[PDB]
Symmetry: D2
Subunit: 249 residues, 4 copies
């Protein structure tokens, strides 16, 4: 068993500090760094990439819609070429920071509403993938496990990592319900089911098959960091190899 | 005699078309593409880089202050690390587009107020140069001919190209007066003096020594494109080799 | 017969000049001034309001989505309270300029994608109307002639002006086709049919009943200004009283 | 003895919560609400104004430079007409929210770098005051106690409130040192000296005469709220009347 632990970092902006990046960076293998559009800024990006380097964490881009006010959690209708180039712009911006710190970008994980819209609109998913291919065909796309987005990525020649969410309730079709488990013990249970059994039961009890390459964890507060630490703890005890996506995708 | 002809392009934004990029691209050797902060956007950047590729024009970054409303022509007080990373962010953003089109970035020419502030503040000039070095130590910095900025670049190990302005009046110290010659014949005269004699007379008649590596030309309207075409015309007749900076810097 | 002529003005931004505001201001009765979100800025707003005052033109707000890059022509999913307060913010911003010039705001006409989304989503139309009511219950909402938006405005107690587009093709249901008549003679024909006959034929020939309170005209270029002048010309010859909405709504 | 207690509120933005507005709103008499340029947004503005109404707190505008990334703490060179209209825009935006909640704006207190720049540049101070006069000549300007800005306001016909900072060290000339007292007991001491003795000693021991109309207090965290509560506590014990500026300016 092998799995990657990813977390959205560098989500602070200007005067506002969001999350506990340095703390959670001690448990994850991959960081999805905001690119200044839905969150983050140059100073936050440089700091986050530096922290990743010091913690031996892989850096990937976390592009989003041009909506700071909405934290990229609101749908914006974009043409395919707009989405393609908007993704390209953000990946390049973050790349400069990885380069400045002697690191290489590993992946690209779209943020919030963009992530959700790609799952629902195949043309948008294709546009985003095209933007990634424009920059580096070796980049790994992080998307919803077993989703059509993954099939499209494979069809277009882009490596893809199937992402699961242990603290989120699932619908029978594999999509997430718009319930969020809060106790670390229960979350740990779900993590084990996913890695050990390749699935989890949906809110109606139906079994959902899941490909597990990476698990999204959080570090918004001490409590979240606590849960993340425990997830790592349990995975280690189960003999699961915790390694970055680049090592097995 | 050899010289590069550079022009600020991709200065359009959203709905607004600024300049005649495709037309002027036929006469220049280097394009300074806006990076979305003071002007430009992802679509404009992609289009401008594509046009450069088709016209065999070298692409360089034209970063500016985060002030769209002011077109980057207003001073903003930045800390050295802010300036360093703000430059890095914009260079990376443009790099993605050059990469997408199979091109390599050649230079970095700061825009408007940032360009002027670097000439006046050595600590700011150093911060910008550090940001460029963070990305690619092979990039060429375009700055005011014979200015202290050029000396600082050399001291820090960054190649630098001395820029002159044939349609701008000069002060005895080599800085530009905050008068803009309008007739192409007169502008052509100044171009010849600079390349042929390594200088020009200031507004008070005093001779100003100038190192001439690149000449800034414009394409804001048919008239400007006309002047630019004539400048190329006259330089050709004088036996001057018109080639991109990378070939001789 | 009476009718108002409105035009979207103050759509310039920063360095970019858009349209021929001063010229077209000589023919219209109402100006819809951008509020800095999809276009416009403080200087453009002050200038446009000053021009309206000098030309005895009524000023109204032209709020849009927070998307400068897309000129407010892209749908953004907003919650009802977000839309309500986003409208309120923009109306207040423009109000300050009307006040500074001794003028009172007459109306509110949503811009681009927001205008279109209101026609399609009753909850969004209601949210926008609530925002207007929050500021001044005497403001007139400009919306698509005979649309459900108008009925909602009436139900909520807000005066509404039915808007028609003489240079746009219509669908049988009263909505516009996503064709734009270009010859002023033909446009003039449509203007006459609307004011004289209270309707126009859709693209399939079916008659469309239209309430005509205000006609949207343009001034993007000399040609558009030419058409606008002609529209005024023909309306005058037909004995139609050209007056601002406040005089008859 | 009478004094107003003001605090910068509504400084949150989008996803980011800054300060403890509702808590500190229980001790102050005047709130300086951000206008969306350096901080704040429509939802934060509406919420803050609603909270002020519920706590019987006066609302004033807290305009700043168009620099979210820098939280308005960075100098930006503006022309007098730019500053005038930039202030006007923000005051109007906030006014809409006060109006929506049945409240009237009481004052205008510039934020961060703009506040500091006005103290240093008389032409900028004049431009800001002109912008306020453009909107409502009855608005009160909050500025540095005994500063030239206050004299300019008086000369231009705008009421002005002299502001002091009990937790900040002073220079002999009345300006603040770029030290911040942290213990509430010491801060309380300074508050008493200012209200009781009309002054405080500068860092070098020299007595500084101060006009005391309003005291800036904070609510960034429980500790700051604690200090603010204590300040109110001590002022009450000293028999000082704590009332909003409009009641005595």
């Amino acid at each position: 068993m092998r799995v990657d632990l990813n977390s959205d970092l560098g989500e602070s902006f200007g005067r506002y500090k969001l999350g506990l990046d340095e703390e959670v960076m001690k448990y994850i293998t991959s960081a999805n760094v905001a690119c200044g559009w839905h969150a983050g800024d140059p100073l936050v990006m440089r700091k986050t990439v530096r922290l990743a380097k010091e913690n031996d964490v892989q850096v990937g881009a976390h592009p989003g819609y041009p909506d700071l006010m909405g934290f990229g959690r609101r749908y914006m209708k974009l043409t395919p070429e707009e989405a393609r180039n908007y993704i390209l712009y953000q990946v390049g911006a973050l790349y400069a920071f990885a380069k400045a710190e002697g690191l290489e970008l590993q992946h690209v994980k779209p943020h919030g509403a963009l992530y959700n819209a790609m799952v629902k609109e195949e043309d948008l998913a294709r546009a985003v993938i095209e933007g990634i291919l424009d920059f580096d065909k070796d980049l790994i796309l992080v998307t919803l496990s077993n989703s059509r987005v993954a099939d499209i990525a494979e069809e277009m020649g882009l490596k893809v990592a199937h992402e699961v969410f242990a603290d989120r309730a699932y619908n029978p079709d594999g999509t997430l319900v718009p319930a969020v488990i809060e106790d670390k013990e229960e979350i740990a249970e779900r993590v084990i089911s996913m890695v050990k059994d390749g699935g989890i039961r949906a809110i109606n009890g139906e079994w959902v098959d899941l490909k597990v390459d990476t698990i999204c964890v959080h570090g918004d507060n001490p409590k979240a960091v606590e849960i993340t630490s425990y997830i790592r703890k349990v995975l280690e005890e189960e003999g699961v190899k915790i390694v970055p996506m680049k090592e097995f995708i």
